[PDB]
Amino acid sequence: RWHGAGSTADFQKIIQERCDTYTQTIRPGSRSRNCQAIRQAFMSAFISKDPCKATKEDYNSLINLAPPTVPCGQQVFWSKTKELAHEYAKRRRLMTLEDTLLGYLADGLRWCGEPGSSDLNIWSCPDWRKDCRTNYLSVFWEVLSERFAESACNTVRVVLNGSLENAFDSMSIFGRVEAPNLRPQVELEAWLVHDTGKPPSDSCSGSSIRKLKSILDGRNVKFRCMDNLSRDQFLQRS
Ligand SMILES: Nc1ncnc2c1ncn2[C@@H]1O[C@H](COP(=O)(O)OP(=O)(O)OC[C@H]2OC[C@@H](F)[C@@H]2O)[C@@H](O)[C@H]1O
């Protein structure tokens, strides 16, 4: 029926296996979490529901079992720079949304259900643009990101793309959901990083970054911006 690719095959085995791996081998030590119950709640959030009627409220319980909250001073946001941001985070022992329990579970997966069926639709899922924005995949990421930003604390960093005309996209999840919900009085450092072998098309002085400074002022978040750095200069030396 839908225009988007179907659900990841064996989605529920994957999220349970990743849950075991994460809670036991990647980030253990804190409180215990039951991975069976986390998988059950994840599945119950969307399974057998209208795939284009997802609400943020459908995920409150799942998120409550494992909020996406990162230790003070270790949190990293990104926008149009996913792989660079993850390399940077890994090197510096920081955490992106993909390094939280739920983000780790969901990273790179697709899922949707179908009314009157207990199973995932593995043939097609709603596309955000061609079908509906109110789909379980897109809504999960928006609500998880919101909670991610609300829990941020002390210094947080963001990696943005200085090779685009607008390194800050106000219609992005970083622009629309994360920056505007960022816990007040944290401090944000932005790095605008450009493709090796190309001059940067955006800077800290550009229009888009001015919009971001405006948002951060309203949250009483201090802002430091660095730019004109190649991926190599940025990584080799932030
Ligand atoms: N871990 C993920 N795995 C798969 N898809 C994801 C993931 N995280 C987000 N998406 C989706 O892919 C899309 C990415 O769109 P960009 O324009 O490159 O960047 P932003 O929108 O700013 O999202 C990134 C920030 O917000 C949350 C934090 F992770 C980041 O700081 C997005 O719409 C999501 O539906």
Numbering used by the authors: 41 to 278
Question: What does the report in the manuscript say about this coordinate set?
Answer:
Altogether CD38 appears to be a key player in the biosynthesis of calcium messengers which are involved in a wide range of cellular functions. Thus, the catalytic transformation of NAD+ involves the formation, via a ribooxocarbenium ion-like transition state, of a unique reaction intermediate that partitions between several competing pathways such as an irreversible hydrolytic process leading to ADP-ribose and a reversible minor pathway that governs the formation of cADPR. The L-shaped structure of bCD38 consists of two distinct domains separated by a cleft and connected by a hinge region. α-Helices are found mainly in the N-terminal and membrane-proximal domain of this transmembrane protein, whereas β-sheets are preponderant in the distal C-terminal domain. The active site of bCD38 consists in a funnel-shaped cavity with a fairly rigid structure; it buries the NMN+ moiety of the substrate and its scissile bond in its deepest non-polar and least solvent accessible region, whereas the AMP moiety interacts with its more solvent-exposed region, at the entrance of the catalytic cleft.
